[PDB]
Amino acid sequence: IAVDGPFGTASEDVFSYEVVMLVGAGIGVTPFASILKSVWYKYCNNATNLKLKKIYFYWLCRDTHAFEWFADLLQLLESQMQERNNAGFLSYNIYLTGWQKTLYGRPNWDNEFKTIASQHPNTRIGVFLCGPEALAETLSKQSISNSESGPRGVHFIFNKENF
Ligand code: NI
Ligand code: NI
Ligand code: NI
Ligand code: NI
Ligand code: NI
Ligand code: NI
Ligand code: NI
Numbered sequence: 001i002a003v004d005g006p007f008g009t010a011s012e013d014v015f016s017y018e019v020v021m022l023v024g025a026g027i028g029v030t031p032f033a034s035i036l037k038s039v040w041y042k043y044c045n046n047a048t049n050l051k052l053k054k055i056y057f058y059w060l061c062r063d064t065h066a067f068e069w070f071a072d073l074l075q076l077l078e079s080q081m082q083e084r085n086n087a088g089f090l091s092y093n094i095y096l097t098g099w100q101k102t103l104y105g106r107p108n109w110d111n112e113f114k115t116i117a118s119q120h121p122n123t124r125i126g127v128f129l130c131g132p133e134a135l136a137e138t139l140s141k142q143s144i145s146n147s148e149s150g151p152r153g154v155h156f157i158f159n160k161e162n163f
Contacts, residue, residue, distance in 0.1 A: 003162060004031035006038040010128070010161040015042060015052050017126030017157070021116065023139065025060035025097075025131030029070050031163045032057070032130065036090075040077055044084065056116055057092035058107065060131065064096065109138055113146040117154040127158045 001007045014020055014035060024032040039052060057074075061067065074092055078100065081089050094102040116125065127143050129136055136158075143156035 002034065004034040006041065008035075008038075010163070011035050011038045013159050013161065014039060014126060014128060015049060017124060018051055019054040019056070019116075019120050019123055020052065020126040020128065021056045021058065021112075021156075023058040023060070023127075023129045023131060023135070025129075025135060026062065027067075028130030028163070029059055029061070029067055030130075031161075033070055033073055036073070036077060040080065043086070043089065053089070054120075055090045057090060058112075059092065059094045060097050060106070060135075061094060062096070062098045109142050110146075113142045113156060117146055117156075120154060121152045122154070124155045124157060127156050128161060129158070130161070130163045 003010050005011065010031065011034075014022070022032055022035070024030070036055075036057070039055070042049065043052070059070070059074075064071070071094075077090060078087075078092075081087050092100050093107065094100075095106055096102065096104050097106055099105065127139055129139055140158050143158040147153065147155045
């Protein structure tokens, strides 16, 4: 059993939230490949657990060919989802940082958290990451700064995972 596999801790944590923000940068996108596959499998066969309803995926990429296989995986998943009546389950943004649209540059995280927040009031959002320690700081800060103690407040819970 792998942490990034169907019965791994990371996969279980991801499935415990109604909505999640998954961020994978560079080689850090690799674990998410197995996680996305397992989540799609569970969604189609796991009657006993129906918690996860929405995935916001962020891919920070420098070399587009090095992980060409990951892009194909995203299209594959996206296709299967549109098929079995579930397009909208996954929304992904790809950022080419070398210098479902693909953008050049890095995201404005403050803007991203606000948008997601406004779309899911009174929701506990799990935030996950596999990438540079700095990006972890940013996500942590944003997660806290964008959460609200109010009744309709949104909660961004950054989950540490041992990839
Ligand atoms: Ni194992
Ligand atoms: Ni496993
Ligand atoms: Ni378990
Ligand atoms: Ni090659
Ligand atoms: Ni350069
Ligand atoms: Ni709700
Ligand atoms: Ni609350």
